Amino acid sequence: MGRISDKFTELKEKREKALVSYLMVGYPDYETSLKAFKEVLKNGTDILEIGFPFSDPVADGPTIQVAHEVALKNGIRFEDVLELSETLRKEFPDIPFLLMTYYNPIFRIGLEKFCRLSREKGIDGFIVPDLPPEEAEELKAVMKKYVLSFVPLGAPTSTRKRIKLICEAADEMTYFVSVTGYERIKKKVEEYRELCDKPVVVGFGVSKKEHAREIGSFADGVVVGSALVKLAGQKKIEDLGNLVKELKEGLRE
């Protein structure tokens, strides 16, 4: 459909796998995070995951949880998150933007409004790590209305039936975690390939070029977050750009 499908079609013609970079708005502070976002985009990021600070990030690892807390103490609001998206959208017109948000904030703000605002500020789709199954259909329906790409989540232990539900739920792409929360996720993706034609990105545990090359050998893309956030924490912008450049190196053929 939109920017996501266009990007994967583009990467395929370039014989590349996608690098999905995840950073948190407001960590270690708004200004520094904005520089970080610009740096990863300038160095090869194909799809951006924009972190929306949340008070109870139970699905994130230690490093990202720190980013959540710090950003919230800096006073980062949903409005600041979208301002950053709008700002980046002007400089990078075709890079797909995925808003990483927990479910509660969407409900608190209001589904219609949340989606309306996201679309107006450049967001292409969402990644909801803790989406309650009993709230999924309603959210998907609203997202469809505002043309926001729904990205279902899979796991190394997803059943064949779940995989088919994931494929039909995905508008343009899917995201699988790499660990049971390697060989296991690789085999799961192969099954996925049998049942689904939509691109799939794999995350968790990526921090070295070797990791990107290995995962990219069977996935259409890799997601990197904690490794980037760590560098951003010390305002090591140059090293961050270097890391993104290196990761992207392991994603070319």
The CATH number of residue 72's host domain is 3.20.20.70
CA 42 to chain centre: 17
- CA–CA separation, 124 vs 74, rounded Å? 26
Helix (H) or strand (E) holding 240: helix 237-249
Q: Which residues pair with 16 in a beta bridge?
A: 252
**Helix residue spans in 44-131 (DSSP H):** 62-73, 78-91, 103-109, 111-120
CA pair distance 34, 216, nearest whole angstrom: 27
Strand spans (E) along 57-209: 97-100, 125-127, 149-150, 153-154, 174-177, 200-203
Q: How was this structure determined?
A: X-ray
How many Å is the Cα radius of gyration of the chain? Answer: 17
CB atoms within 10 A of CB 46: 24
Structural domain including 183 reads 1-253
39, 46, 49, 124: which is the annotated catalytic residue? 49
User: Active site includes 6?
Assistant: no
User: How far apart, in whole angstroms, are the C-alpha atoms of residue 86 and residue 90?
Assistant: 7
Catalytic residue among 39, 60, 80, 172: 60
**Residue 86 annotated among the catalytic residues of the structure:** no
Total domains in the chain come to 1
CA distance 228 to 216: 18
